[PDB]
RNA sequence: GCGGAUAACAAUUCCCCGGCUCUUCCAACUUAGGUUGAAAGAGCACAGGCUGAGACAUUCGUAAGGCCGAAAGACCGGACGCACCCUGGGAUUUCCCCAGUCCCCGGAACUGCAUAGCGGAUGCCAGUUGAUCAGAUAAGCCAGGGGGAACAAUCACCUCUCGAGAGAGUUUUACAAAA
DNA sequence: ATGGTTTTCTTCGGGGAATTGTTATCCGC
DNA sequence: GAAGAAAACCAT
């Protein structure tokens, strides 16, 4: 019911409600459909670029961010819910730290120790206890000294944030810019909540500081208590996606046309821009089979292994059973590092356009199925690639 | 302004379980060979990018000053030593950019270290061939983290008809006025 | 029946130690 | 999420 308009110069204009005029404009070539959702058209002719003030209200969250644009009278012209991938970041970073430590131990430290043992350049006692500065307890260095441990004097800029905190802050800032692309936002209101979630608390001062440099003299702050009062006074239904509506309407001095937005908000999903991991599966389990049935997982138990190993099998079975055993160790699997990534736009073999949620299956170097953001699976060989992932996607 | 408490998530180094390839030897099971296992030993460690030496061991040295001792030295201290600190320049590094780690030259203030780190000497571990460059050369560094740009087979809402086709549905992108 | 193709279903490396750091909130002097 | 094996299928 609301169409977004962009001028010929590319400057956002006010939304229209005259859908018949939009259809006529597109029919005669005076406009082009820039985006499917939200439906946006760019004018081809030249006209006045005159816009009334619009207020943007941000309900901030780690997982769900609400955004609502209202007019000076309180009419709502845009509501969006953004689902972020912030929770993924700490686990990916922890996995990366573990992989880096494994790289630096298996490929560097152990090889150096092997070379020292082979060359006779090792400790006479074989191991040494080193007490390093800043430590009260020693470390054990086997056959050679440790590589220098650097933890005494490491500095960061004032205001340093973790990759997770930076991700949340940059996501909050990026959704505002994407909204500014379609709408002429004049004022921004941010909800500030009293202390009672750690990353959000870390970024709120930074978000407020950088939201005031983007809107000089047009940045406002509201409280979660004011949202409750607004909901009680104006009767807005209790729903999270409506909270941003109560935030933007907090900036309006004389509210006359105030009503809860009717319809469903736009839903935005976040997809990672890079996947730098080459390996898919490091199959490190040496499985033993007795007549097609698995009986042991390794020669001895690995760390935190509940399943029996070959040691238990040998202890509980004869020599003729161990002598008749088959070994399966699947090779490591690797991803296609130049694959079609989630968030991409494709058209199926029947003309259906969809956003890629994931790729399932593979045969003869080809993806089997493309699963979209609605759950439907499409034959990937009869699908055509249209657009790459752009980070934030309407679905 | 400082101190304390709480939470989140960032970094360096070390140690282990397990995994892969090969050798020796023993055992079991099978058609001299083959399969599985035990023991001992050796090598190996995302796909990759950069780099030509930098890893290791022993030994010597590592300011002034204070304090203990007669005997070198112990402790404090910290610089004229070193740096994770700081200026500049780089690798990873790319469609654009960053984070993190690391390297090189230098050392005003700040910060940190002296059982460390750095340097010297001695030993040990590479590669070497094609026309000054190129090649080769590891016990060298980084590598599984984040955003953005660009890329469409982009026509939505409403009405009518049988998912498909057609359509001024009030005028301006919009307010205002007008209809 | 045999060979090729599509659909369902399964599965993915861990532990410890010597240390350090940043951001936010709150409290107190 | 993504790769790959087993099952299931459909067939000529
Ligand atoms: C948070 C929801 C944001 C949805 C808005 C999507 C922004 C797309 C902007 C397209 C405009 C491109 N162009 C060339 C006209 O500038
Ligand atoms: Mg809120
Ligand atoms: Mg490699």
Numbering used by the authors: 3 to 115, 116C, 117 to 198, 297 to 495
Mind quoting what the paper says about this structure?
Transposon-encoded IscB family proteins are RNA-guided nucleases in the OMEGA (obligate mobile element-guided activity) system, and likely ancestors of the RNA-guided nuclease Cas9 in the type II CRISPR-Cas adaptive immune system. IscB associates with its cognate ωRNA to form a ribonucleoprotein complex that cleaves double-stranded DNA targets complementary to an ωRNA guide segment. While IscB and Cas9 share the RuvC-like nuclease domains containing three conserved catalytic motifs (RuvC-I–III), with an inserted Arg-rich segment known as the bridge helix (BH), and the HNH nuclease domain, IscB (~400 residues) is much smaller than Cas9 (~1000–1400 residues), mainly due to the lack of the α-helical recognition (REC) lobe. IscB associates with a ~200–400-nt non-coding RNA (referred to as ωRNA), which is substantially larger than the ~100-nt crRNA:tracrRNA guides of Cas9, to form a ribonucleoprotein complex that cleaves dsDNA targets complementary to a 5′ guide sequence in the ωRNA.
We determined the 2.6-Å resolution cryo-EM structure of the OgeuIscB mutant lacking the HNH domain (referred to as IscB for simplicity) in complex with a 233-nt ωRNA containing a 27-nt guide sequence and a partially double-stranded target DNA, consisting of a 49-nt target DNA strand and a 14-nt non-target DNA strand containing the GAAG TAM sequence. To prevent target DNA cleavage during our structural analysis, we co-expressed the OgeuIscB E193A/H247A mutant, in which the conserved catalytic residues of the two nuclease domains, E193 (RuvC) and H247 (HNH), are replaced with alanines, and its cognate ωRNA in Escherichia coli cells, and then purified the IscB–ωRNA complex. The cryo-EM structure revealed that IscB comprises four globular domains, including the PLMP and RuvC domains, with the RuvC-I and RuvC-II motifs connected via the BH and a β-hairpin-containing linker (referred to as the REC linker), as well as the Wedge (WED) and TAM-interacting (TI) domains located similarly to the corresponding domains in Cas9. The ωRNA scaffold comprises five stem loops (stem loops 1–5), four stems (stems 1–4), and a single-stranded linker. IscB assembles with the ωRNA through extensive base-specific and nonspecific contacts. The 17-bp guide RNA-target DNA heteroduplex is accommodated within a central channel formed by the BH, the REC linker, and the RuvC/WED domains, and is recognized by the protein primarily through sugar-phosphate backbone interactions. The large ωRNA scaffold structurally and functionally compensates for the recognition lobe of Cas9, and participates in the recognition of the guide RNA–target DNA heteroduplex.
